[model samples]
Target chain A: KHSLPDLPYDYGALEPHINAQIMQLHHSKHHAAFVNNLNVTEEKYQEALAKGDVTAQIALQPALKFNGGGHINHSIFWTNLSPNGGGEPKGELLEAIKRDFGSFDKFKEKLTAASVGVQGSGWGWLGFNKERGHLQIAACPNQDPLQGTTGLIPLLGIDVWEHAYYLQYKNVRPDYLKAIWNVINWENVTERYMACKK
Target chain B: KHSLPDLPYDYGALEPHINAQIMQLHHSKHHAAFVNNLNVTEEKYQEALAKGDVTAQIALQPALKFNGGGHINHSIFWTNLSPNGGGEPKGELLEAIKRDFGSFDKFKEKLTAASVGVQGSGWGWLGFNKERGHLQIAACPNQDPLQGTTGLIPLLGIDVWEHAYYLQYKNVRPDYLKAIWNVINWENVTERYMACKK
Candidate 1:
């Protein structure tokens, strides 16, 4: 039974960049539903699996991917933000970003452009390319997890879903993207990148 | 240069069911961008095509589908709603609904279930399967049009994207689905259905 994860910081912590109301509703309301739905979907999936029902199983893939991916992304999303976040990375993580995308500013623009270009609900990611042994950037549509679709190790994710920004940012998503730089938890992002090495 | 279509009614016309702010944004803001983006994408696609650049063309499919389908769906969407809309179909349209799905309520429930079941940005549709000669339903992810993906002639569409209902209905999409019944222009739906028979 997959459960909704508890947030590490207070909902109000992200503050001015992402408002308290948006955070509270996003975590408690939106994220919880995914957790709850995934649990129910898992039970139903097992029933289909036991019965050898390929048709039902095929239909269930969307739910499992959506709710399961929702669980995965949001689990990382909370940790990716901090009141003291922003600025740039340090040490190995910073070096890797610079190595892959030339400079920190270039990497920032690349990820930001991809995230903003998402036609609808989606996430933009900085990930580790295991085979290529370098950092990579990917933009995913909907709740698809970075690893699940691209086989890259998720380092950091920026959710561009309107639900992530609509209430506070209205239709001006670029502004939301610009402001989110102030709350990115580089400390947590660095840890994820480091873990991928071994 | 495909331009954005003019809405048949005033943005405030569908009030109480769908508000002016949402209508204005969904139309002038969201839908307009699709038209504009589609135009830009078309020019790029032609350049790629002229150069025999399959890679660029392949890369452009999502943009084409997203923007093109957005243009297609929103063009249909504005005409599908009216101030004097709602209730139920009449004449041949009503006859076909009963024949296809057993009853109007059954058809309503089926479409609503499919719409509510969409996990992310997407649309639920009432489409015509010309070969089978029956009415059908399809739920599409992102901006994929019914005919382009499923070969079903789109008669009616219900936009389930969060942007469609988030501002007004919040997370409770079912409420938005329930309320949309009050504004579904049956006359327009019937016209689309009639066009398919010939």
Candidate 2:
């Protein structure tokens, strides 16, 4: 059974940027639902796979992606934020971001724009390209996990799902995107970047 | 510039089984939105293609699939149902069903099961596998058009999107799937099958 991971910090840790209420509901309610659904979907998928039921497997893909992606993305998402987060990276992560995106400011601008431009529930990601040895920006709709769907190793992610910010920022996603940067755990992002590079 | 096609039958024609309100909203509102969005996305895609903007093109994939498949699937879907529809198919279509699935009842049972099993907004298709020259059952999530995504020529489709039946059937998708056979448009499906065989 898939279980929800405890948040690395208190629900109120990333204050002023992402509020306590949003974190509590997002972690407790939203992520919990995804974990529960993913477990159920995986159980069903195992049956379909075992029986060689391709049709049933195809029918199960969406739920698998939605819930499974939800679980994977959110687990990473929690670690990606911290009260002591934000600012810039120090080492190879920063160097790679500059090389791939032309500069840290530009990378930030592009990622922010991508997050803001999402037409509906989705995520913006800075992922590592194993083949090209570069960083890439991508957007995934409706909980499609970055690695599973796109084959990119996620270094950082920004959730733009309405539920992520609608309670706090209303329909203005730009403000949420802007505020989220303040709490982005660059150390966690740097660690992810290092792991993928090696 | 893509446009919504006119429904061949009046909205209320498939009433009692499908209901007029669902048809109206599905055709006029939901389908219309897809067409409009498709046109917009295609225009953007054209610009991205011309510019060799690989990232932009990649970013546009979801919109392209969602709206493009929405338009294609629904266009075929309208013709696949009729006020005068229902009952078993005749001639080659019937023969093929027997060969592929043992009998018409088995085919119906399988298709109905696939349709009812859709976990979210999607469609269940009875499509022609041209490469193998066989009938195949497949499901697509959130308008991932059967032909484009799976390379199958869609002969008949059952839209299991909540919007397709929610107002009339509420959350009971099995009821909607069960009732839809009363308007199956076998002639249209047969024609599609014939076209694919040639």
Candidate 3:
């Protein structure tokens, strides 16, 4: 069963960039809810699978996919952030970001633009294309994780969902997009990037 | 020649929910860029259409659809909110919210769940099905507007886009989603709903 993981910092730790009230609700209420629902939905799917109810299993696909994907996506998302996060990449990840996106500045421009451009509920990702062995920027809608639907191994993702910012930014989303980079955990991104290439 | 609209209130008016820095950047830098780039892409598309360049026009369709949709979606989104917003619907919109989903509380639960469940860059909408004169909740991937492809009239839309919340919520989108209701203009929703039924 999925459970809420410990956030590295307190709900208000990312304050200024993200306020305490929003964090408290976002984590305790929102992410926790996804985890709880995911477990419940998965249990139902397991029962259907055990009964060999193919049609029932198929029918359960959307729920499983939605809740299951939500659980999977949020789990990684928690670790992707840190109060001590962001700066510049070290070693190979830095090289890859430069190579694929020209330079870190350029990469930021592309990523920031992509993140802002997402129309609705989705994520913007800097992922590793395993087959191509290169880095790419991609976007996905809702709880669809980048790694699941696309072959790219996700290195970093920017959550564009309004709940991520409406309390703070309201209808003005771009401000949140630009400011987030100041706190992006490049170290975590580099670690993910190295693991993918390994 | 399309330009970005100035925010009705100062960046700081939404404080306590969102900060001034985030608002300014979100409005001027981020949204403006989209408006600018969308115009450029549309102009190129128009040139292609005018010259009867079918191949080029077809090639430009995706960009046109994405940016064009982005512009239209954001324009409505800006108006959907107000400092004097938040609270339950009073008339047809509220009655429909109750009728379609059992009750207002249940409606909120379903809408929030669906919004969080989006896979990538897209939107979660409470739409009015004009043909059936019924209310429905649906999600779309990327910038695709609610009414354009779904044959539904958009009464209320929640942008699940990352730029909507990343700076404030980080990866915890549900937090941003939950807080948004505080600013929801049910009057605006009712107006849209009443208009759509006409």
By lDDT: ranked, best first: 1, 2, 3
Can you tell me the CAPRI class of model 1? medium
lDDT of 2 by residue, B81-188 (tens): 999999889999999999999999999999988887664457899999999999999988778899898999999999986567756765457888889999999999
Return the DockQ of model 3: 0.28
Which candidate leads the pack in TM-score?
1
Give the candidate order by descending TM-score: 1, 3, 2
Off by over 4 Å in 3: B1-42, B54-56, B59-147, B150-198
lDDT of 3: 0.77
Question: In terms of docking quality, how is candidate 2 classified?
Answer: incorrect
Cα-based lDDT at residue A95, candidate 2: 92
| lDDT scores in order | 0.92, 0.87, 0.77
Per-residue lDDT of B41-130 in model 3, one digit per residue for the tens?
889988988999999989877777776777777767766766777878887777888999999999999989889877666788898887
Off by over 4 Å in 1: A48-56
TM-score of chain B of 3: 0.92
- Binned by DockQ into CAPRI classes (incorrect, acceptable, medium, high), candidate 3 is acceptable
Q: Which residue pairs in candidate 2 collide? A: none
- Cα error, candidate 1, residue B87 (Å): 0.8
Clash tally, candidates in order: 0, 0, 32
